[PDB]
Amino acid sequence: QGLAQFIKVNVTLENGEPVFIYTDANGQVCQGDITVTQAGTITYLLNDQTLKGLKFVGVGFVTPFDGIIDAVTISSDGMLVQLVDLDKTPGTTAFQFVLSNTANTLLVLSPD
Amino acid sequence: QGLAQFIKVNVTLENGEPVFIYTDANGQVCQGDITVTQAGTITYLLNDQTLKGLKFVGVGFVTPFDGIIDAVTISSDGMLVQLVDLDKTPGTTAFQFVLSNTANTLLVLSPD
Amino acid sequence: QGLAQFIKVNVTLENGEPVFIYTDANGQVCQGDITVTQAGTITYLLNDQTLKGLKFVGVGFVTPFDGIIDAVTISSDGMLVQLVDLDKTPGTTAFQFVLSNTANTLLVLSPD
Amino acid sequence: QGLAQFIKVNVTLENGEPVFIYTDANGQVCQGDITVTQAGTITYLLNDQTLKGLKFVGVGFVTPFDGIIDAVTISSDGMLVQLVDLDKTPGTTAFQFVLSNTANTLLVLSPD
Amino acid sequence: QGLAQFIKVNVTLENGEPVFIYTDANGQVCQGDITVTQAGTITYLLNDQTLKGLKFVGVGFVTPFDGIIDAVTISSDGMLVQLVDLDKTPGTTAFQFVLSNTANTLLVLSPD
Amino acid sequence: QGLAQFIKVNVTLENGEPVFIYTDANGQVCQGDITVTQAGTITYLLNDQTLKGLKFVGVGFVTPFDGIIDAVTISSDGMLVQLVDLDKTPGTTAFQFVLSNTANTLLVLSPD
Amino acid sequence: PQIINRP
Amino acid sequence: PQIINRP
Amino acid sequence: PQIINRP
Amino acid sequence: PQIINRP
Amino acid sequence: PQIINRP
Amino acid sequence: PQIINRP
């Protein structure tokens, strides 16, 4: 068995552009960072408050072959992405969320 | 925080038809059933040994609105499906895996 | 030449869950079963009365390689699935309809 | 009940370009035209002999709202398209097959 | 460097059927034909005035391997298709636009 | 009329991770940056030398509503993305390419 | 091809 | 449902 | 398979 | 429509 | 990369 | 965000 961690991805608009605010299971603002100490999953739930019809399309990595995250799964409605982390390779990876929107055909990225 | 459970979905061919054999994190054969005692996730990994190019397309329920499972997520390569279970509604649900194959255009179902 | 048979798949909600009622070209309730006596097609039309945004995603078989059904085709709006049955292999197969819904990310199955 | 008609869509390459040759259930070359005298279906099976990885993507009509064809269904492997024709509206419609190919990103059309 | 040409694809309904009217960057009606005198792109913007929920699905060619057009790209909302023309092969090609609609499951073609 | 600019996106692997090298129409290494002085298009061609089955899935922006780029189009084989820039809004935008790969289910991002 | 409907 | 083939 | 929820 | 290439 | 618009 | 793996 592993652990399952749950982060809410709140997206609001400020000065006409998206702002990503992560909340934890306590309702506290956080950075959306996770320390993994055994095999398990991380679940990100989208709360789109932008009116721009945001949907997750995946999770993007500049170093996708580093072995920190094993896999990404996505719900059919784009409201959830989950990461499988078997925590065999030690180290750190960074990623950005990738989203579609209904205002235009550009994909949306979290800044970090 | 919740728990993350991991089941391997082995599919073999016997008398020309698929046979689903579930294994647990100990390598033991099991029924693939999960008791959920707090909020968390269940991860099913496909091990297709059929040569029929099986890929998960989702998880099917005869009673999809019963609230036992909150959501299903799927990897882009069809090798993983994950269930989110927030374990707020007590009770029991049954489901069948749904798979595509490269031999024909019929979808494949686990028997239970 | 073959025969073309037409069944309507009515889906209603009873006690918050889907109920599948098949009707034939006479408007009679039936089981949606078809006896095939020569090569031809079977057409299933969805009549979703659930308000849950049901759409066919395919037709699932526990014994998909049995040769009873040659192929499945689906319309782009998910309102029709058609089965090609060349009726060369004698015998019986059972299947369940597979549907998406707009309430959640779980797939929906007919019970039989 | 209706009738089910079956046409094979043979595609070959001549002078580096596709040539569509329709065959009927007798193995005779024909134009792929169908007269519909009662409600039923028409099934087109792709036989791609081009080496260009052709797959049906649909059936295109310059007068798509004329009511001659009720619907189009397509198999997941792009090898079959089926037309539903309920034969309520009298008259004539013309269409072209639409195919993808693996050599380039241009869609392929039958000439008529 | 090359040139980028922009054509608007206006679609209206007349006698219940689509009519394609091309406009140029001056707002003049034209045939939507382009002479290419160096490498570049052609951009077609959909202006659907039909109420039939038209979206580009691609650009179809009866002679797709003739080398006149190198590639087709499409926006995720189906409102734009772009052609890459590297203008190395001299000659002429003809194509038809291919569109989906929300009224039925038939694809829509421009007449030429 | 506008201008059409063409950049090649070369992706190699170094120390097991992707490296993005942009080349211009002269075969010179560049940053893949474009100054737009009138309405037109920018075409990015993928040259994947990684063996990881890379394909463009889109172009991601942290400020997707800034009006610098009007639209993104993508080829069906993921080898080309094109940007439409009508150059009405002055200013600067930054984006990252988003790619799928066949080694795992993580999306790949250019670093800038 | 062409489809002719005779109802 | 069930399909029965009688060839 | 079957999921049993005990909250 | 028609595209004419003059290289 | 970066796009700079000069209208 | 960042994931840190401590095995």
Q: Decide if E72 touches F, using CB distance below 8 A.
A: yes
For B76, name the nearest residue in chain F, comparing CA atoms only: F105
Residue B82 with chain A: CB contacts under 8 Å = 41, 73, 82, 84
Instruction: For residue A100, give the amino acid letter.
Output: S
Is B77 marked as a binding-site residue? Answer: no
Tokens, residue B54: 């099986």
Nearest CA among E58, E64, E47 for reference residue E98: E58
Q: Decide if A81 touches L, using CB distance below 8 A.
A: no
Interchain CB distance below 8 Å, B90 and I5: yes
**Domain ranges (residues) in chain A:** 1-112
- A with H: touching (≥3 Cβ pairs within 8 Å): no
Residue E50 exposure: Cα atoms within 13 Å on the Cβ side = 28
For residue B12, give how far its alpha carbon lies from the nearest alpha carbon of chain A (Å). 24
Which residues have C-beta within 8 Å of that of residue C85, sequence separation ≥ 6? Answer: C34, C36, C39, C40, C41, C42, C68, C69, C70, H3, H5
For C73, name the nearest residue in chain D, comparing CA atoms only: D75
Q: Is F61 exposed, middle or buried (0-12, 13-18, 19+ CB in 10 A)?
A: buried
Residue F96 exposure: Cα atoms within 13 Å on the Cβ side = 25
Rounded Cα distance between E72 and E79, Å, is: 14
Interchain CB distance below 8 Å, C90 and H7: yes
Secondary structure letter of residue A65 according to DSSP: T
Secondary structure letter of residue F88 according to DSSP: -
Rounded Cα distance between F56 and F9, Å, is: 10
Interchain CB distance below 8 Å, A82 and B72: no
Q: Is E18 exposed, middle or buried (0-12, 13-18, 19+ CB in 10 A)?
A: buried
Residue C102 with chain A: CB contacts under 8 Å = 77
Picking from F66, F71, F101, the nearest residue to A105 by CB comes out as F71
- How far is residue C79 from each of residues A92, C45, C112, D71, measured CA to CA in Å? 47, 6, 19, 10
Query: Dihedral (C-alpha) A100, A105, A106, A108: value to the nearest 10 degrees?
Result: -20
From its phi and psi, is residue E68 left (phi > 0), alpha (psi between -120 and 50) or beta? alpha
CB neighbourhood size of E64 (10 A): 26
Q: Length of chain B in residues, anyone?
A: 112
Which residues have C-beta within 8 Å of that of residue E27, sequence separation ≥ 6? Answer: none
Residue D102 with chain F: CB contacts under 8 Å = 77
Nearest 5 degrees, angle CA D85-CA D88-CA D92? 70
Interchain CB distance below 8 Å, A100 and E76: yes
Place of tokens 């993508």: F74
Residue K2 with chain F: CB contacts under 8 Å = 31, 33, 92-95
Instruction: For residue E98, give the amino acid letter.
Output: V
Tokens, residue C25: 């070209």
Is D14 marked as a binding-site residue? Answer: yes
For residue H3, give how far its alpha carbon lies from the nearest alpha carbon of chain C (Å). 5
Picking from E52, E69, E109, the nearest residue to D106 by CB comes out as E69
Is F69 marked as a binding-site residue? Answer: no
Beta strands F2-14 and C107-109, pairing class: unpaired
CB neighbourhood size of C31 (10 A): 12
Is B13 marked as a binding-site residue? Answer: yes
Q: Length of chain D in residues, anyone?
A: 112
Rounded Cα distance between F20 and F22, Å, is: 7
Rounded Cα distance between A3 and A5, Å, is: 7
Place of tokens 């001659």: D68
Place of tokens 């006479």: C26
Rounded Cα distance between I7 and E45, Å, is: 54
Judged by DSSP in three states, A108 sits in strand
Nearest CA among D40, D44, D52 for reference residue D80: D44
- How far is residue F98 from each of residues A48, C67, D34, E71, F111, measured CA to CA in Å? 21, 42, 46, 20, 10
Picking from B2, B4, B73, the nearest residue to A75 by CB comes out as B73
Secondary structure letter of residue K2 according to DSSP: E
Rounded Cα distance between A98 and A78, Å, is: 10
- How far is residue A6 from each of residues A26, B4, C3, E24, H4, measured CA to CA in Å? 10, 11, 54, 52, 49
Tokens, residue F63: 């400020």
Per-residue DSSP letters for F8-54? Answer: EEEEEEETTEEEEEEE-TTS-EE---EEESSSEEEEEEEEE-SSS--
- How far is residue E91 from each of residues E85, E88, E94, measured CA to CA in Å? 12, 10, 11
Place of tokens 């009673």: B63
Q: Chains meeting K at 3+ CB pairs closer than 8 A?
A: F
What residues 33-62 of chain B have any CB closer than 8 A to a CB of chain A? 39-41, 43, 58
CB B72 within 8 A of CB C105: yes
For A60, name the nearest residue in chain F, comparing CA atoms only: F107
CB E45 within 8 A of CB E9: yes
For D77, name the nearest residue in chain B, comparing CA atoms only: B105
Whole-angstrom distance between the N-terminal and C-terminal Cα of chain G?
19
Interchain CB distance below 8 Å, F65 and A52: yes
- B with J: touching (≥3 Cβ pairs within 8 Å): no
Q: What is the 3-state secondary structure (H, E, C) of chain A?
A: CEEEEEEEEEEEEECCEEEEEEECCCCCEECCCEEECCCEEEEEEEEECCCCCCEEEEEEECCCCCCCCCEEEEECCCCEEEEEECCCCCEEEEEEEEEECCCCCCEEECCC
CATH superfamily of the F1-112 domain: Cupredoxins -  blue copper proteins (2.60.40.420)
Instruction: For residue E96, give the amino acid letter.
Output: Q
Place of tokens 């006690």: C15
Rounded Cα distance between D56 and E107, Å, is: 12
Which residues have C-beta within 8 Å of that of residue D15, sequence separation ≥ 6? Answer: none
Instruction: For residue A61, give the amino acid letter.
Output: F
Rounded Cα distance between E98 and E20, Å, is: 12
Is D89 marked as a binding-site residue? Answer: yes
Q: Decide if E25 touches D, using CB distance below 8 A.
A: no
Secondary structure letter of residue C52 according to DSSP: S
Residue pairs between chains A and L whose CB atoms are closer than 8 Å: 52
For A111, name the nearest residue in chain L, comparing CA atoms only: L1
Instruction: For residue E101, give the amino acid letter.
Output: N
Nearest 5 degrees, angle CA A86-CA A87-CA A92? 130
Per-residue DSSP letters for C60-76? Answer: EESSTTSSS--EEEEET
Rounded Cα distance between E56 and E47, Å, is: 11
For C16, name the nearest residue in chain B, comparing CA atoms only: B65
Q: E strands within C15-63?
A: 17-23, 29-30, 34-36, 40-48, 55-61
For E76, name the nearest residue in chain A, comparing CA atoms only: A105
Q: Which residues of B100-112 are buried (b: 16+ CB within 10 A; e: fewer)?
A: bbeebbbbbbbee
- L with H: touching (≥3 Cβ pairs within 8 Å): no
Picking from C76, C79, C80, the nearest residue to E100 by CB comes out as C76
CB D98 within 8 A of CB D108: yes
Interchain CB distance below 8 Å, E36 and J4: yes
Q: Length of chain K in residues, anyone?
A: 7
Interchain CB distance below 8 Å, I2 and B31: yes
Q: What is the 3-state secondary structure (H, E, C) of C83-111?
A: EEECCCCCEEEEEEEEEECCCCCCEEECC
Q: How was this structure determined?
A: X-ray
Sign of CA dihedral C105, C109, D2, D6: positive
Q: Chains meeting F at 3+ CB pairs closer than 8 A?
A: A, B, D, E, K
CB F83 within 8 A of CB F42: yes
Picking from F16, F63, F98, the nearest residue to A60 by CB comes out as F98
Is B70 marked as a binding-site residue? Answer: yes
Interchain CB distance below 8 Å, C33 and H3: yes
Nearest CA among E37, B21, I3, A96 for reference residue F112: A96
Q: Which residues of F65-93 are buried (b: 16+ CB within 10 A; e: fewer)?
A: bbbbbbbbbbbbebbbbbbbbbbeeeeeb
Instruction: For residue K6, give the amino acid letter.
Output: R
Beta strands A2-14 and A40-48, pairing class: parallel
Place of tokens 């015998």: C91
